[PDB]
Symmetry: C8
Amino acid sequence: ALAGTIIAGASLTFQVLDKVLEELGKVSRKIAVGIDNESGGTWTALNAYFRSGTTDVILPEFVPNTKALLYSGRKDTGPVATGAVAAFAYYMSSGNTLGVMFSVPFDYNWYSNWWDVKIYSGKRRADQGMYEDLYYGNPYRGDNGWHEKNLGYGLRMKGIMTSAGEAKMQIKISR
Amino acid sequence: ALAGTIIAGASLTFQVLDKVLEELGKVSRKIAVGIDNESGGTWTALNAYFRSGTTDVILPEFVPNTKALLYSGRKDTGPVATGAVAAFAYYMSSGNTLGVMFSVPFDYNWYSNWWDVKIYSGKRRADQGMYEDLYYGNPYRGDNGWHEKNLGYGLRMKGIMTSAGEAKMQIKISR
Amino acid sequence: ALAGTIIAGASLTFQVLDKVLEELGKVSRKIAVGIDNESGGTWTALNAYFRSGTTDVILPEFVPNTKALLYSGRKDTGPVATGAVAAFAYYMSSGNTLGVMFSVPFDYNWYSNWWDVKIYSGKRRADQGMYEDLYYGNPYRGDNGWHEKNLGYGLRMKGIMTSAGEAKMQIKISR
Amino acid sequence: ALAGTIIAGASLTFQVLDKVLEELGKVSRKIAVGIDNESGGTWTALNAYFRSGTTDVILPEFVPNTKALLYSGRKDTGPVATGAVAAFAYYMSSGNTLGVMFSVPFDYNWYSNWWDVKIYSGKRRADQGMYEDLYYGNPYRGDNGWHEKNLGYGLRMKGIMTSAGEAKMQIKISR
Amino acid sequence: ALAGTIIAGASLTFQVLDKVLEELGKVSRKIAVGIDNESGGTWTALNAYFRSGTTDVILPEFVPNTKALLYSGRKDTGPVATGAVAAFAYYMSSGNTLGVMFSVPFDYNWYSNWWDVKIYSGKRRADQGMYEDLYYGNPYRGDNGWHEKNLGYGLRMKGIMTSAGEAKMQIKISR
Amino acid sequence: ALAGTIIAGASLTFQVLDKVLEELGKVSRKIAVGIDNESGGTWTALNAYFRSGTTDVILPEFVPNTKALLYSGRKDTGPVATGAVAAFAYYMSSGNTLGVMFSVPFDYNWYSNWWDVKIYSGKRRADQGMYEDLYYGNPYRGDNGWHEKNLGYGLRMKGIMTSAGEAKMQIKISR
Amino acid sequence: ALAGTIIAGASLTFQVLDKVLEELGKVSRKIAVGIDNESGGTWTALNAYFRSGTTDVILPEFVPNTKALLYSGRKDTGPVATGAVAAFAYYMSSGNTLGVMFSVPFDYNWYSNWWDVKIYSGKRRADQGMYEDLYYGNPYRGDNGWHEKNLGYGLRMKGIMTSAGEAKMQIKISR
Amino acid sequence: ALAGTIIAGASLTFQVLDKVLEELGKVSRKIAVGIDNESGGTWTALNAYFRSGTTDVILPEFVPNTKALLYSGRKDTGPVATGAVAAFAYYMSSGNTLGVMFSVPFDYNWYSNWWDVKIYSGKRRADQGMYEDLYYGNPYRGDNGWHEKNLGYGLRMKGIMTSAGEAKMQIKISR
Ligand SMILES: CC(C)CCC[C@@H](C)[C@H]1CC[C@H]2[C@@H]3CC=C4C[C@@H](O)CC[C@]4(C)[C@H]3CC[C@]12C
Ligand SMILES: CC(C)CCC[C@@H](C)[C@H]1CC[C@H]2[C@@H]3CC=C4C[C@@H](O)CC[C@]4(C)[C@H]3CC[C@]12C
Ligand SMILES: CC(C)CCC[C@@H](C)[C@H]1CC[C@H]2[C@@H]3CC=C4C[C@@H](O)CC[C@]4(C)[C@H]3CC[C@]12C
Ligand SMILES: CC(C)CCC[C@@H](C)[C@H]1CC[C@H]2[C@@H]3CC=C4C[C@@H](O)CC[C@]4(C)[C@H]3CC[C@]12C
Ligand SMILES: CC(C)CCC[C@@H](C)[C@H]1CC[C@H]2[C@@H]3CC=C4C[C@@H](O)CC[C@]4(C)[C@H]3CC[C@]12C
Ligand SMILES: CC(C)CCC[C@@H](C)[C@H]1CC[C@H]2[C@@H]3CC=C4C[C@@H](O)CC[C@]4(C)[C@H]3CC[C@]12C
């Protein structure tokens, strides 16, 4: 009976697809970001632009001097094969913008964790352009290594990002 | 046997529908709203009009000056493909109405999170008209970005709404 | 074999009915009622008449002045397609009766939440007549909106009822 | 094969009976009873006679003046279609017996909650006769309403019983 | 095929027996016994003789005057259709023995709860003879009723036993 | 098909054996032993010899005068039809050995709980011989009864063992 | 159909192997070792050599005089039929090495628990040679018995090991 | 029917693969690392290079003198047959680099736990070269044994690594 075999095959297809979707839904991609502000002035949040994923918290409005920013991101809920990729911008009291990019990809056999920090002149909101500038420029690997560079404008950066799918990023901005 | 194949196909259909309804019922759409009142006077609640969804709390009767409003909304219980969309109104002591709209849709490949704040002359209750004015005017995206505008009548607004299906919205109204 | 097909169909019927009855039993209809008494005298409970549903608490015997009544209702246990509909009466010290109606229906595509408050001359127990008077008169919608009216006899009402199947109602009676 | 069809039908019958017995065993009928004693003297327990059901507590030996009796009853354990129906007796210090009846039936489309209180001359134990006198006399409905009557011998009663299958009963006996 | 039908029937038999044995194993028969000693002297435990069942505690060695005995019994573990039936004996300081019998049967449509208290001259250990004397004499029903009698030797008893399969017994021995 | 019937019968056999082994592994046999030492001197542990079962605690090294020994035993883990049977020895300061035997069998329709206490001249370790001397001599039944005897050497014993598969034994040794 | 019978048999084989591997994985073999040091000097850990199994703790670096060593071992994770067998060595301040062997086998119908303690001249690391010397010499049984011997060099040992698969070992080394 | 047998075999294959992937995902490989710094100066983290696995913590930025480093590593999430293998580097205040390697493999019948510590001239980041130098040089086995060596530059090392798949490593660096 053709119909009986079709029903058996459709049932097997249903079981396999159910398992596959459950597996895809259990994949975890998220990041916890901490940034120390020793720049000498308050930071004012502009926006976070998520190329992939979303967040369960609002971008904290202010980061006073000698205080820390706590932020986080995660992939979209469900069996969707995307990660947590974003760039966010804080307007500094010195009159320039601190842009921070992270990328925690879904497919780890084509991509890796990446991150970068840059200073943009004036007031600059995070968007796809800023994310492309940070990601396709010279970003750091999320390689469990500490990295240091002069940001310019009398500011320097020191930070690290882990290599895990549930990533941690720690950065200090100093003057 | 035709009847046996019909019964097998019906059993498979029942399994598939049970799975689909369970997944539809597991979709989460909700919003938590905080509004700081620095206008210089008490706010008196008028009403919340839900275009979609409902709420587990009553609209707080009063918001005193320098205090905050806590409110929330959620989608309807069950496998129903709708979100949490509403506009609510607070009569301010200055004699005008603060109207706030949020939209957290169900289907995110056609819609996005949106929100807006406006002041209406006199005492004005939230209804479908207020929701349409806010949503089909010039609303902000729930895009994880802070936005500021002059509300008029000596009042200004600064706020943010996240992009998640479980959204957070934070607004401060200031004079 | 006719008997074998009958057994297979009966088994499928049993599975479907089991699921349907479980789903019907999971539907939740309940209400939490709070009423502030600022009338200037004690209220004495008469009775609550439930058109639909029941309650897990006794109608509180007294509500002193400046105190609040806490009451609740819910639908009947099991896969029964009814809601929580009632009218209850408190004898006020002024010599008249405060009647309160709520309706939280089961089927939300034919009915909505409704509520009302009225004052009846003398001592009047809640019954089907009082429920019909409140429900088929000019009741308020449970629309997440605050409503105000003069009850008469030097008393006024201000209250709100939410639109959810698990509803909250808040009322204040004032003089 | 006749035997194979008999075995299939027997398996279906066993599944259906298992389901039915589980549901019958999940039905809950019970009552929690509180009685305030303001008669001016101690009450001494005589006995509780359960027409249906049983109890997890002993009838409290004494109820001193200005104290309260806490008692309870429940239906029999298992898939048995019976409720919690009883009459219990307390010998009052005045020399007469306070008899209290409650009925929380199993089948609510033939029966309802009922209760009553009476005083019997002298010392009188609860039995089937007392239960029949209270139940087939003029009992109150467990209808969420407060009721008052003069018990005689200088005593009066005020009480209420809820309409739920998990019932609450509150009575005060006063002089 | 005869063998295939035999395997199908044996599988159904195994399922039915598994369910029946589980149900039999879930039946609960136990008793909690409290006895107040106001006799004027210490009691010294002799033994408890269990006609049915066993216990999870040792018979307390002594019961001083104005103190209480706490004891318990239960049916045997597993799908065995027996109850908790025992008689236990305490040697009183006056030189005679207090024997106490309880019976909590398994099959409640042939038996009921029963209990009794007696005083035996001298030192008398509990055995089958004592249990038969108490059970087949004039025992009290576990009927939720308080009972009183003169034990003799200047001692009297007042006690009660509930009618449940998880029974409570409370007795006071007084002089 | 012979092979298909063999496979069906083997599957049924595997199910039955799995159930039987699970039930056998759920049988509980254990004992908790307390021994009060009022002999006037310290006891020094020699050894415990387990005819059946084992223990989760070490034999306490010393039991000082007026202190108590806590010990325990249990049946072997798994679906093995054996109980907790042992004899253990404490060398008393008076120069003789206190030997204690307990038996909590697996199969209760052939065996019963038994226990005994004896004093052996000099220093004597527990072994199969000591266990046989105590068990096949004149042991007490674990029958929920207190028993007393003169141990000799100026020492006497009073103790009790319960009849349960999870047994409790309490002994006091006195001088 | 040969293929269908092969598939049915392979499925049964899979079920049986899954159960067997789960059973093997639940077998527990572990040991907790405590050693009191009353030798008069500090012990310095050298190494533990595991003939079978592993450990979740590091060999404690030092055991000061009048302090205790806490160590543990266990069998390898998974359905592997091996136990917890080891010898470990502590260099004593007197210039010689304390070697301790334990064996907790997997298969208890061919092996038993064993243990021993020895002193080796000089500094001697634990290895297969030391384990063979202790295990194939004259080791003590883990028989729930206390054992005493003169270790030499002015030192003596007193200890005990239980007979369980989850074993406890207590040893004191004294001078 | 060829298609029916193919579907049955595919269903069995899917069950077997599901079981195998679940078991592979349950394998646990991780390491917890503690390093005491008694060198006389602060350590500054450079980086950790993971040949296999990843980590849930960032490499601690600094290790002050007389303080300890806490670090950890684990295998990649999912049914991937790899372990936790890494080398990490701390720049010491003396001007040289402390490099530490650990290896906790997945397949224990081809590999074993290994570890090593070395000092490299100047500032030297961990990479594949450092890992190869440590692992294919003369590393210590994670064999539950303490090991000591002179690191040079006036520094010495003493440490231990356990043999478990959930490994612990303790090292002290001293001057
Ligand atoms: C072959 C037979 C059994 C098909 C029966 C039609 C099924 C597929 C139809 C009938 C009723 C339908 C539902 C009706 C209403 C809703 C609520 C809506 O917000 C989302 C879709 C959902 C949940 C529909 C899903 C599809 C549905 C279950
Ligand atoms: C076809 C065969 C298997 C039918 C067997 C008859 C079944 C349906 C009968 C036999 C015994 C019956 C039970 C006997 C006693 C009680 C207790 C009563 O308070 C509620 C009904 C209940 C629980 C009955 C339900 C129906 C029942 C289980
Ligand atoms: C067709 C074949 C498999 C039938 C085998 C007979 C079955 C039904 C018999 C054999 C042994 C029996 C058990 C033997 C002992 C007891 C303990 C008693 O206190 C209650 C009944 C109970 C639990 C019996 C229930 C019925 C029983 C399980
Ligand atoms: C038809 C084939 C599969 C039958 C195989 C024989 C079965 C029934 C036999 C083989 C080994 C046996 C077990 C061997 C040892 C023990 C430990 C003993 O203390 C209780 C019984 C128990 C648990 C036996 C139960 C019965 C048993 C499982
Ligand atoms: C008919 C086919 C499927 C049979 C395949 C052979 C099976 C029975 C064999 C192959 C590999 C074997 C395992 C190999 C290794 C171990 C670890 C050892 O410490 C205990 C036994 C155990 C767990 C073996 C059990 C039996 C085993 C699973
Ligand atoms: C008959 C058909 C369905 C066979 C399909 C091939 C199966 C057996 C193959 C295809 C892909 C394979 C996997 C690919 C990658 C990995 C990660 C590796 O670290 C461990 C093995 C594992 C998990 C492989 C296991 C075997 C695997 C699942």
